[PDB]
């Protein structure tokens, strides 16, 4: 159908937007901490800890396999990545105050991101 079409290619301009903030955020993480997921051979206990794990290697591919229906989705998929490390990780190490700075930079990003998704549908 002709909508199917439409949607797909609304689908694809958020997908578009997406890549764009994800771009974003990811230069907010300058030494490459939260790039790839956390090895489970050198810390063979995070399962115990951590239920979800999330990364933008992991974002990433979802991203391009259009699986992002919607901003929330997306947002849910970057406040993992925050929220994980600040568990794991105490308060005084540079991976948890690493956290706490994307978090804080990418806020910027998300909220202009939300209104030009409202905005241009």
Avoid at 10 to 27: A, G, I, K, M, W
Avoid at 62 to 81: M, P, T
């Amino acid at each position: 159908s002709m909508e199917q079409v439409a949607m797909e290619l609304r689908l694809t301009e958020l997908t578009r937007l997406l890549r764009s903030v994800l771009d974003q955020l990811q230069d907010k993480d300058p030494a490459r901490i939260f790039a790839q997921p956390v090895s489970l051979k050198e810390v063979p206990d995070y399962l115990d800890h951590i239920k979800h794990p999330m990364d933008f290697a992991t974002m990433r591919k979802r991203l391009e396999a259009q699986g992002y229906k919607n901003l929330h989705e997306f947002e849910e998929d970057f406040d993992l990545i925050i929220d994980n490390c600040m568990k794991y990780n105490a308060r005084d190490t540079v991976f948890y105050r690493a956290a706490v700075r994307l978090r804080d930079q990418g806020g910027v990003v998300l909220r202009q991101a939300r209104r030009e998704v409202d905005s241009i549908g």
